[PDB]
Amino acid sequence: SYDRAITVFSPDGHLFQVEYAQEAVKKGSTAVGVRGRDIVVLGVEKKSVAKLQDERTVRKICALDDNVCMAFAGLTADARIVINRARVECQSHRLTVEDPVTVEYITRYIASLKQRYTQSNGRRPFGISALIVGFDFDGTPRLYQTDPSGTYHAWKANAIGRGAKSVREFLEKNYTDEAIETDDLTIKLVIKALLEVVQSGGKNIELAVMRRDQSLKILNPEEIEKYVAEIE
Amino acid sequence: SRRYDSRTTIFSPEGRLYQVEYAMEAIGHAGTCLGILANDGVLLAAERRNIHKLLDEVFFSEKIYKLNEDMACSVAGITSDANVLTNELRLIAQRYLLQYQEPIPCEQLVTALCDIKQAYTQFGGKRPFGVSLLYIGWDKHYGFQLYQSDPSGNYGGWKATCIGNNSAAAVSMLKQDYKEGEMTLKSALALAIKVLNKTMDVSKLSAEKVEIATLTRENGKTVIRVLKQKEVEQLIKKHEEEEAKAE
Amino acid sequence: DRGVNTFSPEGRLFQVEYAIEAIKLGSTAIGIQTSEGVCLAVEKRITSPLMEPSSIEKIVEIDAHIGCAMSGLIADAKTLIDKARVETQNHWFTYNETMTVESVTQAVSNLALQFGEEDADPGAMSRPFGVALLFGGVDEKGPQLFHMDPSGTFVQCDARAIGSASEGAQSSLQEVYHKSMTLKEAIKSSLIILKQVMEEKLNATNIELATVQPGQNFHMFTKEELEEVIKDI
Amino acid sequence: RGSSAGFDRHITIFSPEGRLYQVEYAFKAINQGGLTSVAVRGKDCAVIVTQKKVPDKLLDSSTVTHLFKITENIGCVMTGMTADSRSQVQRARYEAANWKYKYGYEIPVDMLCKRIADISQVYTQNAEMRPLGCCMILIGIDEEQGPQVYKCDPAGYYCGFKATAAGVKQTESTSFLEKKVKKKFDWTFEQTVETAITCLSTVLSIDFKPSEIEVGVVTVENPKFRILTEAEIDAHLVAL
Amino acid sequence: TQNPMVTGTSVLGVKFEGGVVIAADMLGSYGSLARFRNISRIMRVNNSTMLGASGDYADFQYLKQVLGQMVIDEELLGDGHSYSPRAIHSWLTRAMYSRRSKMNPLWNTMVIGGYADGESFLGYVDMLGVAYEAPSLATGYGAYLAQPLLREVLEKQPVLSQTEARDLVERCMRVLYYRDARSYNRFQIATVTEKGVEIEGPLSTETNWDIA
Amino acid sequence: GYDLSASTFSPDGRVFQVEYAMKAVENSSTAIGIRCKDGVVFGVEKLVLSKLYEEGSNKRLFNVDRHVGMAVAGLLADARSLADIAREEASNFRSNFGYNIPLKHLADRVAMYVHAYTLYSAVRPFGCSFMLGSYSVNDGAQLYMIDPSGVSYGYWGCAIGKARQAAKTEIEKLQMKEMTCRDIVKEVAKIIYIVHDEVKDKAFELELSWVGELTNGRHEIVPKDIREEAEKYAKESLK
Amino acid sequence: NQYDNDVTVWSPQGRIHQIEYAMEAVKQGSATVGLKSKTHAVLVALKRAQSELAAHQKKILHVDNHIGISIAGLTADARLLCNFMRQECLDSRFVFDRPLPVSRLVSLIGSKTQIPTQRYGRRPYGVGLLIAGYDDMGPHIFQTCPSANYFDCRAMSIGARSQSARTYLERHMSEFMECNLNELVKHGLRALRETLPAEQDLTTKNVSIGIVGKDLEFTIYDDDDVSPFLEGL
Amino acid sequence: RGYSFSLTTFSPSGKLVQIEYALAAVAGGAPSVGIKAANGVVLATEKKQKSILYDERSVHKVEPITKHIGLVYSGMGPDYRVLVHRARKLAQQYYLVYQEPIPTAQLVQRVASVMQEYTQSGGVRPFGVSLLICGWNEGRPYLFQSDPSGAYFAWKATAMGKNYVNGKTFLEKRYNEDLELEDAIHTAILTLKESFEGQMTEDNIEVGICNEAGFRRLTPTEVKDYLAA
């Protein structure tokens, strides 16, 4: 077994491997999502489509459970380990509890997993950040954000990836009770935020909406163009 | 000992993995290999590295290493680092057929190795595999598929892609002459030879410097057949003669 | 260059020495031990208006009669508060009694300074904890308020302030504190010093406070209960 | 000449020329003892001779020896760090004993050196451990091959010898005795003890006394390794 | 030990004023057979503590090398602290209890005498870990054939002398010779006093008289 | 940087971590021993730093078995571990083989325990030099000394401490082969005081022990009656 | 320069810097004093003030009924070693049903403390302990240091500015054995008083006094119980 | 306890330096020349002792794995031995499971996998030895070359050791696919003559052949008979 400390303390109380793990988050694709009333929306910005891609497996929006899904930004490899192991916890929690997983439960499990590899021997922290949405048993929407350091926080709106500092300021002033009222206006709030961080033009993005009844069905490229034409 | 450790699994100040980024440049000098997703089948065109005349033929292929009856791969990278990967791929694919009594879906076997290739990019302090190898095959759901697995641990679907030497100039050619859904098998064999010309410094192709394997469905059974020397030379003579008619 | 276990020329053990400096990057947490109870006040440090303040817990439930305030990295203290909740249940399970605050802080602080990269265990901690926890509650000896340093040194404190503003905040505690003060004065005296050390505007949203009475159990004030104390300051 | 880059100066790995920059210094560590061992085999016998130097009068002559008995029919002589010497001898006695318990018969000199050479090789390939700073010379009487003299080094090279030299004078004692490769067997018989003595006394110009060295032999008539008493060494020293 | 092989017979004991004395005959027993009669089942632990055992003699040699060697280890550093007779009785009771927990018990049945701090100590250690302190002790069949005679004298006279307790042991040992098949004629007598443990040579029961 | 690891040889083929380990022995006070015809006599110069230390503190004479003594020169920390390991080496022998351990075997088992830590970078060589001595009917008296490198040689007498050469000149002319144990005890104290420096190290406590036939093969600390006789006889020759 | 990063690396002078840097941490700690008479052994220590409102510390821990210690060093490493001492003393009464001799308990410390020193990736214990216990041989002051070696002392003082206390102990060291129980503690009080600045004095709250004896087991005296001892000072 | 971190890492230029420097130890070793003929494969290496005191009958640079398989090396002596003794173990582990003589191509893949394991797992350096592996299976000759990285290549004829570049070009001219085992032995000896610098004799080289009768090394008496031509 390889036992060594990769993440160690530094002068002025800093963690190099943890801070540089967050640098890989800002080097990935931009993922933006918001929390509405009965609706939650997730979306990502693809860097280059090129029309050689198979759009099914390159999706950055995964589903941890029927009521819980997540979208990340960062190294694509570091994400797949998180999604796969979180789906195991969602199934193991249904075994003992006999109830669907709460959105904060799987968020703490992922945050503690991102935390564990920071203080573990011979293990590097994740280079990803996760945006998790879902609905509890009472039907309340939830939006959470996890960091490579292991901290998790709820959000009304959040943005991760490159250019997230400009999108977060865009979502801060434009978020209100009017835009989060209608289900269609909530979807357009993410697209309007994604178009600001995409310098290419048009819609290269990928967006998925998860409601309560009939969970999540990801929107096709033709369906996302209808909202982009209405906001033009 | 910390003095002797090279810190392979750490992060760079810019957010990069050193041993992962340096393993990509080993692939840029590695053997040129490409693949094309068509309607009735998928092919693998790989430029042979060692053309040396005193080299003999051992078993069935060179860089191919067929992983199963329903799917095959092609490797570009350190010649040794590809062997352990192909062995583990044959282990994962057969444990599925052992456990589920079904042929392995091409999407599942790629995900399994990319977790093993990632395991050395995170914990253990070892070096990552310097081989990025492609995937071809057929399943009962999405049919023919083509994958590309990087040493970083990430993969993705591809209609047309190339790995190895001159991969950047090869993908650019596959962005134009390729048509989604309109490419058949025989049209893909001609497109593979067209790319292997401009992407290789040689004046032409003698058919001993390339190896092509096709995967098609025959009578409900997936067959993997590597094109022989006489079958590849017919493709080269077809493209060399057609190039004179276009100018 | 060097490992996690090393002694300085002065014997300061840099890893914990640098872990204490990580506390100076965290939010301010203040608490007071009175004869009628203990209080724990901590700053949330809201980063953005889109951040939900209800999801920031720097004060968590250890036992029914015990509560703790946190500072620094929120993550590193999550594994310590989890072992505390297990330790309080392991004592009540075996001995059928409420676990004293002295043994709770002592057991959690045992995880401090215990780390290594050489043959520690199958799992191990690569670095100590860069967090400072203020433990509080009412035990058989009365209300007790304790602190836990990254060096594993726990100290009984009547009033102690931690976090980035800890310097200059402790000087404000020693002036206004006396042994005869009540709990209602402790909640009011806490927010006054918080008003000085907090950069943004102090309101019921960005402050988090909880108290432990001898008669009652650990309880955290809601949004409506914090509005009454702020108007009194 | 030889390039040096990276950690080559500390842990054993490939030099830019692939010379094992670190392994080559285990041979120089043998010369740190300042001693020379001369081993030579005849037709019916094999002889080992090394230098015995007492630095202080308080030393006990019987306790300080470089000749060790691995088994009944196999002798030994060591040149190198004496601390590394006793470690390799105990491993040879433990390895030769596992042979008899597992395989039923006494171990030949052929495969007693290879296993120790394989052990010393493990020190060369692993970076966490240094090679031994001494070399082992093992002698004995094989059933089919008769007398055998082999030497393993820190690099793991056990290849055979018609005669073996080691130590600081190894280079001088090898070329001098190489001229004794002339006549077939160099008059090989019981008096080959003097063959090793005159080679050791020539390079050091010492003209050793009876107790100045220590000698041991293996023979066909007496397969057991015997350490010659200083009274018996004086008989051969007075004849030359 | 699942089943014993070479077994011993009753070992007596009594505490008098000034020390403790026990006695055991020298005989081996395998399947109702006298095999090794030269074996000595009475062990001298150290100066202030003496020991004797019934039961398996092979397991007793293990207790000879494990317990006797610990005495040397305590005397290596030599700070002036020595094992008291009740401390060895405690360590030995712990070793006997740890064996039955793993289901590998020691068939030995032991009696530990000693004199320390001006107080005579006597103790009993069995196979199952039963331990206590009684003025008189007899193991095996000695509990049936001897201890009744031991308690009879000690009930009227709780404190004995060195010569009177010696006649008590020799008279109870002679009774063991008559009705016990595992008994034997020659027997060892060891006595701990302020001068230490002294193990006397062989004594014969041949003074016995059989009237038929 | 060849000296930063015990597994790294120098360009001249030397291991400094082993060589710097024996330099700590030169920073420790002198401890000597003498093997005579009737047994083995030990002595140690024990430097007490502050007068607050109790007499007998930091004992330099250890008994690894009843018939074998031990005398150390070096870091006192590594001296007590090697004493316990030498106890375990003699402990496992009497358990398996059932008889007292020959000091030829005991010194060889401990010398390899010391050398086993000189071949790896994960451990450090011991910084103390220690000597062994014993007496037996068949085997007689034996004295060996183990260096920090793990090498063991036989000695009639040996000197390890601050001054190594100064005490050897006094022992070589002693002619110990014809002298009994009681005559050596008076001579050992004479050698301890002559190599002592009245300038640098002031306070000291003489630690002496022997083993031989008069103890019937047993090693013990010198009684006060004999020790007082040897110290007074040694100060008389010091002048 | 490069020899101080590892404990297993010897310096050119035949010296280990890492062990000596651990002995620097015990001198940067708090001054602790202890001494023995022919009857009782007493430990007197300064409880350090981290702030004005905080109960200082507890630097004296209970090991066994007949054994007690005083902490100078890293506090978390003290109880980590003390828990082994508590387990070692309970080991004897469990197995041997006798009090474990103080001289043998300290010998087990030197063997355990040495193991981190010789192995790579581990650090020596950076806490010294003044151990007071009553065995069959009388009181025992046996000292433990970051270096695995131990010393038997009649009187000893460690921690910050302990040299001024050793000067007081070395002068009166002849009369310690003739002192009674009440007057014996007063020597440790005046010895510990020399460890304070001219602006500081010995109070009841900052002083804890351990005592062990023949007919009296090891007991600690709190701020209220140290008043009779400070009445003559 | 051993090092768990890999000593071989990717250079900034995208190469493995410990394997690249391992080829330098192979290039400085003794020349070994394999040739695959129609009915058999011959392995000819240069065995040169630094002095006349060394025993030529003690160690054999050409050693058999099984009766039908043998292999020769160009490079360090010791790093070949632990490598070749494990090849003998991996060959019989096949014979235990399958009760069949191990194929040559199957034996090379298992040995090359072990040579790869030490180029990846930590605490171990790569091998400085390259292999020329021959064998007779299924009525076909086999000649393979194992690189220190763990890569294998099927060769009709090749050469390694000192002056391998000038030696390899010497084989391609005089090599023919219709050559027999007797004709391939002389061509393998002539390559060892390309760089010698001295007078070569029967004890100055080591040669062995693998035919349908199995693998065996040529005795010094049989080597002298081939040197007269």
Author numbering:
A (entry chain D): 2 to 233
B (entry chain C): 2 to 248
C (entry chain E): 9 to 241
D (entry chain A): 3 to 242
E (entry chain N): 1 to 212
F (entry chain G): 6 to 244
G (entry chain F): 4 to 236
H (entry chain B): 3 to 231
Text taken from the publication that reported this structure:
The proteasome, the primary protease for ubiquitin-dependent proteolysis in eukaryotes, is usually found as a mixture of 30S, 26S, and 20S complexes. The 26S proteasome holoenzyme consists of a 19S regulatory particle (RP; a.k.a. proteasome activator 700), which is responsible for recognizing the ubiquitin signal and unfolding the target protein, and a 20S core particle (CP), which hydrolyzes the unfolded polypeptide into short peptides of varying lengths. We show that 20S proteasomes can degrade the ubiquitin tag along with the conjugated substrate.
S2 may represent the particles not directly or obviously affected by substrate.
